[PDB]
Amino acid sequence: GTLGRAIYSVGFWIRETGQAIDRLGSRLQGGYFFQEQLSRHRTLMNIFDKAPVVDKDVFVAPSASVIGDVQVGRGSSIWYGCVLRGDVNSIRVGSGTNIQDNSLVHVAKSNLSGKVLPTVIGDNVTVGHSAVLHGCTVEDEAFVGMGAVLLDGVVVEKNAMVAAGALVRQNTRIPSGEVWAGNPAKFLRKLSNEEITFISQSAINYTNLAQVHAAENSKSYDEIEFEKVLRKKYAR
């Protein structure tokens, strides 16, 4: 009503007063405080023309920069803090994979002296936290996780795994079904069959978890506020 109009005007006035006080405070400060900006961060971007091609049913955490020509298929996930930077050469990851948070993928030597190096990740590959992948070809259903790093034209194959510190270097053809470790990499076991089923079940249930995180992380402000008030009132 008219009362509403009046108090709206009054609220606008005192809000202006607040802005003025804030500027006065920054100017009493000054030179030091880097006042806040908007996000200005890209979850997806191109480089020269290559736009990313991302499946619809994927999860991409809004703290994961995909840049270049990244072709990411179905039922996969690019978790938090991730960096899929293929600005120089092609990146294609299989369908049903998962890059568990805070990992990186880069490629270097596009079409120099004839020899080229793409980078491909097979289906149902579960690369873990802090995994560095620098120009590699990981065939489908292979396990790499917890801080591993692959240096060069390495190719892992068909259920092989490198675990927890594997620094694999300079064009290693990983045998079809093993485990490696070591700094540098050597094998020490035989990768039992129930463990193969472990990596498969890992890919599957991790796709499930990624779908949950997507449904959560892709909400708007009003829906989030509703969810929060409902959670509080219910826990009451």
Partner 1 sequence: TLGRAFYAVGFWIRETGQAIDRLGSRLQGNYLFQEQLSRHRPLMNLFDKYPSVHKDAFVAPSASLLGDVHVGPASSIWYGCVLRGDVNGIVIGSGTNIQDNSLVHVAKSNLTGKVLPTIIGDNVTVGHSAVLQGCTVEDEAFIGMGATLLDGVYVEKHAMVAAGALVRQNTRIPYGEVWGGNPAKFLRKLTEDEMAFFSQSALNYSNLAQAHAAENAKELEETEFVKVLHK
Partner 2 sequence: ERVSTDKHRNYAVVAGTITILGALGWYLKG
Residues making up the binding site for Zn(2+): 106, 134
String marking each residue 97-136 x if it binds partner 1 according to CB under 8 A: -----x-x-x-----------------------x-x-x--
* Torsion (CA) 5, 9, 14, 20 in degrees, nearest 10: 150
Q: State yes or no: residue 3 binds partner 2 (CB under 8 A).
A: yes
If the CB atoms of residues 25 and 193 are measured against partner 1, the closer one turns out to be 25
Per-position x/- string for 11-50, each x denoting binding to partner 2 as judged by CB under 8 A, each - no binding: x---------------------------------------
* Residue 1 interacts with partner 2 (CB under 8 A): yes or no: yes
Q: In 24-45, which positions are buried (b, 16+ CB within 10 angstroms) versus exposed (e)?
A: eeeeeeeeeeeeeeeeeeeeee
Residue of 164, 120, 166, 127 lying closest to 144 (CA atoms): 127
With CB under 5 A as the contact rule, the residue among 75, 84, 106, 139 that binds Zn ion is: 106
CB 223 within 8 A of CB 211: no
| 126 within 8 A of 202, measured Cβ to Cβ | yes
Judged by the rule CB under 8 A, the positions of this chain that interact with partner 2 are: 1, 3-5, 7-9, 11
